[PDB]
Design a protein around this nucleic acid. Sequence first.
DNA 1: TAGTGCCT
DNA 2: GCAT
Lengths: 207, 207
Amino acid sequence: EPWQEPLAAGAVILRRFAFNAAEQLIRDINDVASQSPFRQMVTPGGYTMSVAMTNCGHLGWTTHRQGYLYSPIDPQTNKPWPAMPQSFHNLCQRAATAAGYPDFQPDACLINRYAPGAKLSLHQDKAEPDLRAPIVSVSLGLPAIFQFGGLKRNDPLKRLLLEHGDVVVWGGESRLFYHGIQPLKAGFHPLTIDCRYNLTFRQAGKK
Amino acid sequence: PWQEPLAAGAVILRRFAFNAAEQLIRDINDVASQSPFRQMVTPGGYTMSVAMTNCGHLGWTTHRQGYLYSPIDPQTNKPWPAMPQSFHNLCQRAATAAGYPDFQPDACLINRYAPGAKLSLHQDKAEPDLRAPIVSVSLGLPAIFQFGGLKRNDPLKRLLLEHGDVVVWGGESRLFYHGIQPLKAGFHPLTIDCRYNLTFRQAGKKE
DNA sequence: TAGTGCCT
DNA sequence: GCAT
Ligand SMILES: O=C(O)CCC(=O)C(=O)O
Ligand SMILES: O=C(O)CCC(=O)C(=O)O
Ligand SMILES: [Co+2]
Ligand SMILES: [Co+2]
């Protein structure tokens, strides 16, 4: 079934942890996306991102003229983001628990969609005010190479092949570690067809 | 010397700084000879009954302007005195004993309470990195330390903290409400008629 | 700012 | 490493 692969202090890959729940989540990805479509956000410096994005839950990650921000409102629809699906919340809390983060209460889910070539540059998740809360990151569909630092931009990166069902969780000592996804290679998956989805759960607000 | 549970992520290290107390006080005096103890007025207009100074990279002060973490002491227009080795060793030993092996303070606020002096119920919420615990050292006269929950009105535990007692809280109890009741007059051989507290914090960003 | 691209 |  599902196994573990430690990464760094506070960081684990829960291999295939989400494999069983994958269909229900992908279904929910569609339902979220029907309310708040995937869009390729433009960074504050004017770059269009290659990853296409949407959000569900109380707070959604968004780009804005003044920098990267969490908003209760989808500027694409000027409505609040969709409620977080029960399957999202359930899988997430299970993972955070299996990962040794017992009381994770996410208020934010970023949905990433990678088409072939799409990537996400090395970066830290530092837009969140409460650093105690872990990051839970679910991989679905096409395989990708995830790199994992690194408190500095340039200390050794681990390069991990993340497959459909894999969940990476990080936090505590590794909460601000650099990470990213290399240009997605083309392929097929039965459940996602031609792309890779990622679900990043966070506590983006304040307890 | 010994441990007592206080809350999730919080312990009392009874008499933990008893052995080092004489050196800590000498180190207080030296720190004070550069950045003297001073009164502070809060944004409310009330002068605090506690006198304060700081040592370490970042010092906390409050004003009718608002509180401030700064590398400069407003009274001297110079950096706060560097963190004394005794302070740094004791803090780290305390934090490891309390389950926080990686605590690196960059800030120590020194409080001096005279009889009648108090510190109103509050949260330590000014620090951006909430993963770092608070290490809280008692010296001299005994005081009642209030320790509650996340909300202002959550039930309060009245704890009698005595010379050498160290309190450590973090994780789930990190933002818990707490405070000091008006100090009763008394005598202590090492402080005469007053109580010192060392509050160690990570006030800036961790490396 | 840069969650990008090395711009010529 | 750096641009702004
Ligand atoms: O797609 C991934 O696996 C990583 C996602 C990510 O870095 C993010 O959402 O911040
Ligand atoms: O004197 C004490 O033990 C409490 C000090 C405190 O709560 C503070 O400085 O914020
Ligand atoms: Co990220
Ligand atoms: Co306090």
